[PDB]
Amino acid sequence: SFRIEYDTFGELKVPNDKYYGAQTVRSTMNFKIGGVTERMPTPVIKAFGILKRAAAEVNQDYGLDPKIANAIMKAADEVAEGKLNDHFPLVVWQTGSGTQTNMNVNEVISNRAIEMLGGELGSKIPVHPNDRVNKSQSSNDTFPTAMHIAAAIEVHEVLLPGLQKLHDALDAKSKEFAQIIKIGRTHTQDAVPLTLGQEFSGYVQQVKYAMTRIKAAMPRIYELAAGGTAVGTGLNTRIGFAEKVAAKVAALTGLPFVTAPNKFEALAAHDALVELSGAMNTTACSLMKIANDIRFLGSGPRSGLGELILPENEPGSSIMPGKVNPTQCEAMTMVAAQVMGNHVAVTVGGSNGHFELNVFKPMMIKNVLHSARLLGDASVSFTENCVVGIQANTERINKLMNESLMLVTALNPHIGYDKAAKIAKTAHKNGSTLKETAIELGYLTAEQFDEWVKPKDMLGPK
Amino acid sequence: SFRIEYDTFGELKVPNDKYYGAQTVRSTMNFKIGGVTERMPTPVIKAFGILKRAAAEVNQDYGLDPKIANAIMKAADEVAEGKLNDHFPLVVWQTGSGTQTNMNVNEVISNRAIEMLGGELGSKIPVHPNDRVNKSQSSNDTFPTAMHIAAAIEVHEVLLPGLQKLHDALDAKSKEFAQIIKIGRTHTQDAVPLTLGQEFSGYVQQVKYAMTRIKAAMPRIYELAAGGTAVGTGLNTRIGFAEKVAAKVAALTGLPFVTAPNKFEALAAHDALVELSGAMNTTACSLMKIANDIRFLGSGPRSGLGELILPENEPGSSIMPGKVNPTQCEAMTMVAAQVMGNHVAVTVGGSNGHFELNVFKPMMIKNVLHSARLLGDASVSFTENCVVGIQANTERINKLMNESLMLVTALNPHIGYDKAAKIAKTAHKNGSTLKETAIELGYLTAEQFDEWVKPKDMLGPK
Amino acid sequence: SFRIEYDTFGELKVPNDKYYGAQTVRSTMNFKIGGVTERMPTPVIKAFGILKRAAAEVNQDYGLDPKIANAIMKAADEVAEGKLNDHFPLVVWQTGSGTQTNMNVNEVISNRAIEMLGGELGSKIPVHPNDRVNKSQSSNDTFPTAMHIAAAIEVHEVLLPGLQKLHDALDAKSKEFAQIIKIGRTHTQDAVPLTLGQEFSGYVQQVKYAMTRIKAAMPRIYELAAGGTAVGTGLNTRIGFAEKVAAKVAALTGLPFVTAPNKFEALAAHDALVELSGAMNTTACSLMKIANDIRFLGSGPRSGLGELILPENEPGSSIMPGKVNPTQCEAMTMVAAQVMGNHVAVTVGGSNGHFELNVFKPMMIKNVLHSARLLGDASVSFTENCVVGIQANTERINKLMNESLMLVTALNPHIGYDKAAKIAKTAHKNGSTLKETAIELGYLTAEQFDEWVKPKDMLGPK
Amino acid sequence: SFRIEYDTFGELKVPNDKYYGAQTVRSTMNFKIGGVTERMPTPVIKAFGILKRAAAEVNQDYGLDPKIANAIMKAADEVAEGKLNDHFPLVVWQTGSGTQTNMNVNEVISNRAIEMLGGELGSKIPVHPNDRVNKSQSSNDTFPTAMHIAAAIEVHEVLLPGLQKLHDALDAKSKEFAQIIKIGRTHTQDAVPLTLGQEFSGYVQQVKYAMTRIKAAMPRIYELAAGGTAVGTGLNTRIGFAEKVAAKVAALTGLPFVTAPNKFEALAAHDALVELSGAMNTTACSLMKIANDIRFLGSGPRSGLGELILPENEPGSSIMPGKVNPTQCEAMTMVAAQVMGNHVAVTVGGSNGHFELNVFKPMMIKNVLHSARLLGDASVSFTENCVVGIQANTERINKLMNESLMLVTALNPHIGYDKAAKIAKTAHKNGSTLKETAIELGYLTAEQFDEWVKPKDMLGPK
């Protein structure tokens, strides 16, 4: 069931159905931290596939036999395509350079390329893990490159598409609610009117601005460290390798990757990941507000605010009509809190580089990808299972507009401030409406009230 | 105007009306970071006065002349009593060991004692700042001792008394509201009843637990670094000085200070400050919940929840009866947010010690004292200006109870499930009460509803 | 391959090899957030097994048929024993009360108990998920109970045992290094001596204190919410149920669980989880310092500090003798940063309760358990793969003690301060040792130096 | 002594020498939280002066009498110029909309203008605080406008200039050290060479990227809330006032302020402050790395790394040549830790808006201004008192290069791998240099070593 390989510490059994080798087995023994939920994120593994395929193709310019390079490229493609995910058992909590995962990737690509070429597994023949798959590379500049490839692809494919769907659904709900006037709330106290459409347009702007902030963090993510080798000098690498690898990754991905102009900055720090996390942290603040507002605006049916009817996600009860838990609001605000915590973990790691190498890399990229996926996935779920189904409770909104004390200020140009306050004071004391009170005191008629108090004239400057 | 003092780098102008000297002027030239709001917290300065008073009294056992010791003690007392606060211009953002503030204290006490002895300011005759005021002490073990003295005093005099007042005021309201039944809220949806007294009793328990948590953090704060000297060994101090100065501090303050049993832990780390900040961080979460709940329970007057009437302390508008902004809730929840951020500042500093000395000391104690003072002061203000005057809106509460759809389950034993549901569903569609609808459907009589639906019976297990 | 079940939204296929039902299937469709690394932690699932077994046994006092109760107890035991982990596919990012996981647990326990009794899967006969497995319970008080059971077991079995091993290994290394004198470092500058044993005793004290802080957070974790039902009143539950369930959980676990004295505080907030996270946050600060110190003390072989020889964890190179990457230091400091971020996520959730129910529960317990397991697992790994193998580089330590300028202060009682400084100044200028310089200037003999400069006399007070 | 003013709650003693009035005295009575270090930041007060000056000039278009407008403008100018700072006693911990400070500003400007018009202080004649100084404005849109004005000015005048000085000083050192070769460090282990110039160029790039990140956060800060009034609709302000007052602020400041295109987003949230704090958070991570590296590179003189000689700004001990504490590194890394905590405070506040108004405004702007000022001031101090005077310890660097085992790979083409390894292994065991050992083993000549081992050739790709 197993073959036998060796490292400098002793003999190791490797399962015959596995493409990794002795270094990866030793690593599962030396880094038993946290269990399977801690495995290196698949976007990192796939990004390594993209990177090893670009390096193999470029290394033909520097003496790599095309037959060996072609097998490496095909094997790297299978990694990048997600066909070999089961051959990566290592956790985030390894060396802070990600060396063990670089070797896991070199081992798997070598053994699969060996198999494609007819050799025997575990043999290093004819594709040596370090000499061929890791040719012209270091763990020090490859893991950072994989981080930025994975981050950019996840932003492009998961995070922004999720936010875009949320933006568009909130914008639709904003135009659908454009004529529904409700009582505003400041300090949670009753305030002057605005439309539900206006209130929702604020959410739309926040999501639009979140997308812009995330996009503004991407140019530094597109800088790749490949070619910095061990300490950033590019020692033991060939001239032009850095530019060529980056240009190859860009063509493979369709994204504007470039080589980092300063490889010392690219190896000794991950400030671009701190900044991207910062943009997700702002996004989480925006989404906390939007989701918590929608939560409260749907509270009720009778002892809450009751402006919105949220779609049911849980089984409703026949005995409990109108009760709807805001389920997606809760998942989303829990996600928002997680992103804020992830951002502090990214910050602590990003602040703790030493000399030529920051060695917090796996934890930093784990937290960035975790926030990116949570935000994108929750944005989709919140859209499809809550926002698109939101309805306005117009009867309750209309009833509360008539019962509000806030519109009393439309009477001042007609009967004077002092008589307006007496109406408001009296209605507040008696629990009556402004209209009932304004008439019961003989200050005006019902026809005068209905003509002077028009909330649709209280929604803008004059 | 000025006098002239000298250090080994040249001449310095010292204001004649100031008790500090050359080293302190030099320190103000080198650390112009942030302005006057960044001055070293007065509790640290006073704690330094206590410590120097204790050292001078104890140092009589080790050769210090009693007439010199007496003037040092009297000057140090003035520092500890807050009488010389204007003679400390240095900011938090100085050396990470606090050496500049230690020198500031030595100079101020030296010069004030020289003045009491009839000497000339700046003269070092006959009270030398380092050889007599800093006798048996080091740069490195004095500031951490002052940190723990200041934190213990602030916890004892400001933080716990403020929380005690808040606990007692919430408990009185809990008892005052013990019979007022309202509709519960889970997920912000209407839920089964509880009293305002029960809900407030949750707040009371939270504040009680906060006080226990803070008290649980004090035993390690009572351990003092004095006697560790430069690196923790006690080199260049006298045997027994560590224990004697801790006991003298205990007798001067009435708090159970002892010498730290491991001086390397006490100099190389400030884990006790991190743990005390963490207890305040939990307190902040509790206060955030309490204040935000009271904020929303007082929302209205007509488009909110309207269960509580909060005291109006700042005049409002005559045209706006019933509109009262929950301004003390806002001060308190802002303070809570600040404590959470301060806690992360404390954490980063506490995580970053190097070898024998943590050199983030001034910023860690600044954030701990800041949090303690804000929490204590806001608790007093929130108590006196909001909690003690809260009234229940019993009329609105009673009406909302009658309009709730939640109570409809008390009718299950009497008319079966299927009829109650039809009442709930029909009331929900018509906007009428459960009682109106059960009568209009002829499923029971008014007197039957009033005898079957008793919220008083829905407040406990059976 | 599948059976057919229904909920109020439509027909659902349930795999026949799965013990969950339609509610769980619907939940995997409604909460597609984050993928499989986001699954509810297994310690929560097992804790639910303990809880449903205690409730079933107690519910016999309240009309539960013993035959049905016995099948429920056996099925709950299989959940608690980890035999049914594959039947829980739901993610953390569900409703904030954990309702979906409560139903997942009720469904799986019902179907497995049905199978034990001979019935057909998916039928609810004879063990109804809600009426029997959820009898006398609410999602609102069960998920909090499972959180605290899981937290206490993880602290007892993973976190503290890991820290204890680390404490004991550091204490052994401290006694083994008790006679090795080295140069201290303050501000990272050379300082007076202390032994490696003394420096390591500081680490030992930090870990001892971390264990005490964690233990001080457990009494509030041992308070269980079971019996609070929907809003904390205990409505729809039987008198004595809360005390009996808690006493049963305590007997099943061997841990001192008790019923929460105030169920409103237990449902509306999770301040005990915030406080336990706070204790882990302090622990992370302590471990960051210890691991980073050991990292730097092992730096070299020639351009670093070079006091410690760390055991190899990576394949060493023949060309690179003495180069050893501090692999476990990096995994541990990365873990420490993660705990600090997790703590902020716990804090944000803990601060955001609303009225009767905090609905951030799954994210809060996820982060607490994640920090607890990471800290315990990394503590074991750091112990076995680094601490127990640490050796002192005594030749380099001894060589640097002889080259240090720091010991020049042992000459002052013999040749006076002024002549001591001239030796230090001259050796610093020439790059020579104090001994060479003190002799070359004719201030003393080699025999006088060797007798007056004894670092073993510079390790304590006099 | 005092004069007497009145609000609707009674009589208030106002100091005769103060320009504030009844509302401000009332505010000091109700918000005694934290003491004088908690006063509203002077940049907010000055920004309010700019805003009130702009509003008064624009309000001439809307009826304001030019002679009244002129005195308001002149008084508001004195506020903006920092001439009336003593007339603002209110703390940050006030209403979450900043209303008290808005009233403080209105009263101070009203009374100073009344004084210029020859009236009596407290009289409201002829400059009414709310009817003329607050004309066309609201409580709710003035404070957020002042926040953004203050943040933009502080970024432009303090933060970016400080970072610019640090960037330029690091770049000059980079060029000064361009030819000094030293041993690299990865994982803190010895690594292949790089120049001090290359390493410092990484720092330069980090500071350059920090400045770009901060600049990228300013476009949303330039959007002003003025004109949103109470809830965002602009009710009770004039058409065109929003655009005109933003343009007047732009012309007064020379910064590209514009009116916010969505006033609901601008009042309900402060996402732009969260994003600006996040850019400063990234800056803090960069500065932490730079300062901590320089801290350790200057460690010694003999038991550290010893590559850099840092300026000695505070006198040391004559008995301790070469011992220089990196005190500016400590101030800077403490500041970095503080910015990270401030950022979490900003995040919590920014996440907690409610409906039409975020009421965490004073604490959010306080933390943003605090971070900006600390970063700017510390950058200037770190530059002038450390960076500009750093010297390389070329003699020690050259010796460490010669004693390194890293260079041994240049001998591979000339004597093969196996002989070089035996040299490295033997030098490592004997404590001798690579050159001494290769000669003593007779594998090459001294002149052969000097020609084969050229570190100048190991600094780049080939």
PDB file of C-alpha atoms in Angstrom, chain B residues 39-52 76 78-90 94 101-102 104-105 108-109 143 146-147 150 369:
ATOM      1  CA  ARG B  39       1.968  63.784  28.389  1.00  0.00           C
ATOM      2  CA  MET B  40       2.790  60.873  30.679  1.00  0.00           C
ATOM      3  CA  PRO B  41      -0.402  60.101  32.672  1.00  0.00           C
ATOM      4  CA  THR B  42      -0.579  61.845  36.021  1.00  0.00           C
ATOM      5  CA  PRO B  43      -1.301  58.501  37.800  1.00  0.00           C
ATOM      6  CA  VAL B  44       2.176  57.302  36.745  1.00  0.00           C
ATOM      7  CA  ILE B  45       3.759  60.535  38.038  1.00  0.00           C
ATOM      8  CA  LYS B  46       1.979  60.187  41.396  1.00  0.00           C
ATOM      9  CA  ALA B  47       2.923  56.510  41.607  1.00  0.00           C
ATOM     10  CA  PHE B  48       6.562  57.536  41.048  1.00  0.00           C
ATOM     11  CA  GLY B  49       6.163  59.919  43.998  1.00  0.00           C
ATOM     12  CA  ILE B  50       4.934  57.037  46.162  1.00  0.00           C
ATOM     13  CA  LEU B  51       7.803  54.812  45.020  1.00  0.00           C
ATOM     14  CA  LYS B  52      10.518  57.429  45.604  1.00  0.00           C
ATOM     15  CA  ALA B  76       8.233  62.954  46.849  1.00  0.00           C
ATOM     16  CA  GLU B  78       4.208  66.519  46.969  1.00  0.00           C
ATOM     17  CA  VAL B  79       4.666  64.623  43.679  1.00  0.00           C
ATOM     18  CA  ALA B  80       2.410  61.787  44.893  1.00  0.00           C
ATOM     19  CA  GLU B  81      -0.243  64.260  46.088  1.00  0.00           C
ATOM     20  CA  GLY B  82      -0.449  65.825  42.630  1.00  0.00           C
ATOM     21  CA  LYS B  83       1.041  69.143  43.724  1.00  0.00           C
ATOM     22  CA  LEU B  84       3.880  69.233  41.164  1.00  0.00           C
ATOM     23  CA  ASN B  85       2.084  68.014  38.007  1.00  0.00           C
ATOM     24  CA  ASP B  86       3.245  71.076  36.009  1.00  0.00           C
ATOM     25  CA  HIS B  87       6.875  69.966  36.337  1.00  0.00           C
ATOM     26  CA  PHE B  88       6.481  66.880  34.077  1.00  0.00           C
ATOM     27  CA  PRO B  89       6.422  67.872  30.370  1.00  0.00           C
ATOM     28  CA  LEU B  90       7.521  64.540  28.820  1.00  0.00           C
ATOM     29  CA  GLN B  94       9.847  58.375  24.853  1.00  0.00           C
ATOM     30  CA  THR B 101      10.276  60.058  33.132  1.00  0.00           C
ATOM     31  CA  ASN B 102      12.350  58.352  35.857  1.00  0.00           C
ATOM     32  CA  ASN B 104      12.254  63.771  35.279  1.00  0.00           C
ATOM     33  CA  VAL B 105      11.022  62.477  38.662  1.00  0.00           C
ATOM     34  CA  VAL B 108      11.986  67.357  40.262  1.00  0.00           C
ATOM     35  CA  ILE B 109      12.289  65.652  43.653  1.00  0.00           C
ATOM     36  CA  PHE B 143       9.091  52.450  35.727  1.00  0.00           C
ATOM     37  CA  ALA B 146       5.313  52.761  39.002  1.00  0.00           C
ATOM     38  CA  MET B 147       3.097  51.213  36.296  1.00  0.00           C
ATOM     39  CA  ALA B 150      -0.682  53.441  39.197  1.00  0.00           C
ATOM     40  CA  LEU B 369      -4.907  53.806  32.551  1.00  0.00           C
TER      41      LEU B 369
END
